[PDB]
């Protein structure tokens, strides 16, 4: 057994997802707007040869807001909608086809040196049956790297591996707002339309890995 060092490039690409559920009734009320895990598949090219990779994006530490426009059978409420802000995290899994990810079993140390990215939000229409429709638009946040975590599950003499990246968050210049309401000009990124009609987001950087490998 012997210790080695692996210094490679990395590009990670990801998305968001959501779920929107109404309540039963006359059609004026809404119960949930929340995040949901999403996954993506791509190929990119290092110095020598192309590599195919996978990601899975998730979230934690979620702030949840609400709106209550009275109590009648014909009024606009939102029971819960979620938003990501300073007290929250973004989790991204990553596993690759390359020769370097075969030696990520017995890891001594691991560091990563990525750069930041900004995610901004789009717009969403609340389609009431009768009347003008309120909209929810705006919001922005930026992502900064905060550590790497490896985990294993033990199931019948076979290990099941994962590699997760952490990202802390900081609010940015556009505020979000909900038209035809009193709710006024907050910061953070809601889950109405996170992707803003993009195919993916992108972060590039490098990492350094030290691990025990079996010596020939």
């Amino acid at each position: 057994w012997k210790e080695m060092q692996y210094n490679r490039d990395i590009t990670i690409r990801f998305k968001f997802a959501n779920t929107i559920i109404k309540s039963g009734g006359l059609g004026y009320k809404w119960s949930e707007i929340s995040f949901k895990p999403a996954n993506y598949q791509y190929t990119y090219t290092r110095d020598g040869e192309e590599v195919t990779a996978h990601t899975t994006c998730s979230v934690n530490g979620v702030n949840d807001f609400s709106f209550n426009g009275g109590s009648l059978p014909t009024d606009f409420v939102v029971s819960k909608f979620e938003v990501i802000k300073e007290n929250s995290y973004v989790y991204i899994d990553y596993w690759d086809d390359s020769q370097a990810f075969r030696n990520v079993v017995y890891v001594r140390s691991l560091a990563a040196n990525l750069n930041s990215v900004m995610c901004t939000g789009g717009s969403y229409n609340f389609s009431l049956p009768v009347g003008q429709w309120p909209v929810l638009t705006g919001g922005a946040v930026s992502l900064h790297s905060a550590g790497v975590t490896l985990s294993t599950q033990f199931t019948d003499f076979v290990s099941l591996n994962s590699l997760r990246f952490r990202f802390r968050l900081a609010v940015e210049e556009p505020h979000f707002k909900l038209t035809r309401t009193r709710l006024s000009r907050l910061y953070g990124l809601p889950a109405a339309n996170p992707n803003n009609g993009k195919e993916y987001y992108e972060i590039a950087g490098r990492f350094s890995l030290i691990s025990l490998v079996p010596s020939n």
């Epitope: 210094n7 490039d9 140390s109 560091a111 040196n113 990525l114 750069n115 930041s116 590039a204 350094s208």
Partner: antibody
Framework: VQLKESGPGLVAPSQSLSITCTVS????????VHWVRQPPGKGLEWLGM???????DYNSALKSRLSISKDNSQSQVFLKLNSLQTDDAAIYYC???????????WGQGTTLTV | DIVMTQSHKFMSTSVGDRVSITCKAS??????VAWYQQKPGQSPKLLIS???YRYTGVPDRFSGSGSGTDFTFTISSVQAEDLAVYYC?????????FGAGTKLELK
């Protein structure tokens, strides 16, 4: 944060070089440091990088000459470069990494005559 | 080895007007270009980190834009202190590469 270079200033051909960059205001176990240079009448060129733990990247053309080490306790990082030619006359800088390759804070710089 | 090429080496401008400085890339660098400034007898200073994102202690008259391979750096109104040299860096791949350098001459 402050960075400060200190070098010989005059060296003969086919000799060595040693520059010491003493840092202040931050820790070397949290951040990572670069080295660059600028020849007269030419643009800037990248030389190397030392990581948080002991780990180095180098330039491909000058890989077989130079080496970078550091000391965490007495907060100072030093460079070496051997068997140098008359092309190597430049002003050497030590700078701090912030993001991926962004050079956040720069030093004063020492000049080399050969 | 992505090559960053600035087309000009000198710019002439007056005391209040617009200045624009450009540089191209050899490959596709997806919005990962920084900008620097070096006043006479100093060290360089970071101004724009990404292709548009300004830094904290930078005046409001500096800005930047661009995507793909073409990139710009603008000043809305000049002053007498803006006489320096400017650089465009790429921070997308493993060796970071600088541009040539464009001196600004105030007329």
């Amino acid at each position: 944060v402050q960075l400060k270079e200190s070098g010989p200033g005059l060296v003969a051909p086919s000799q060595s070089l040693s520059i010491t960059c003493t840092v202040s205001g931050f820790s070397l176990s949290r951040y990572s440091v670069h080295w660059v240079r600028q020849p007269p009448g030419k643009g800037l060129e990248w030389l190397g990088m030392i990581w948080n733990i002991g780990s180095t990247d180098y330039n491909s053309a000058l890989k077989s000459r130079l080496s970078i080490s550091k000391d965490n306790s007495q907060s100072q990082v030093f460079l070496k470069l051997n068997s140098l030619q008359t092309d190597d006359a430049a002003i050497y800088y030590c700078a701090r990494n912030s993001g991926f390759d962004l050079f956040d804070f720069w030093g004063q710089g020492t000049t080399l005559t050969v | 080895d992505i090559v960053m090429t600035q087309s000009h080496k000198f710019m002439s401008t007056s005391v209040g007007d617009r200045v624009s400085i450009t540089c191209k890339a050899s490959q596709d660098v997806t919005s990962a270009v920084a900008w620097y400034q070096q006043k006479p007898g100093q060290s360089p200073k970071l101004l724009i980190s990404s292709a548009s994102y300004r830094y904290t202690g930078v005046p409001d008259r500096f800005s930047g834009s661009g995507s793909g391979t073409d990139f710009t750096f603008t000043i809305s109104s000049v002053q007498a202190e803006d006489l320096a040299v400017y650089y465009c860096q790429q921070h997308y791949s493993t060796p970071p590469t600088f541009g040539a350098g464009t001196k600004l001459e105030l007329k």
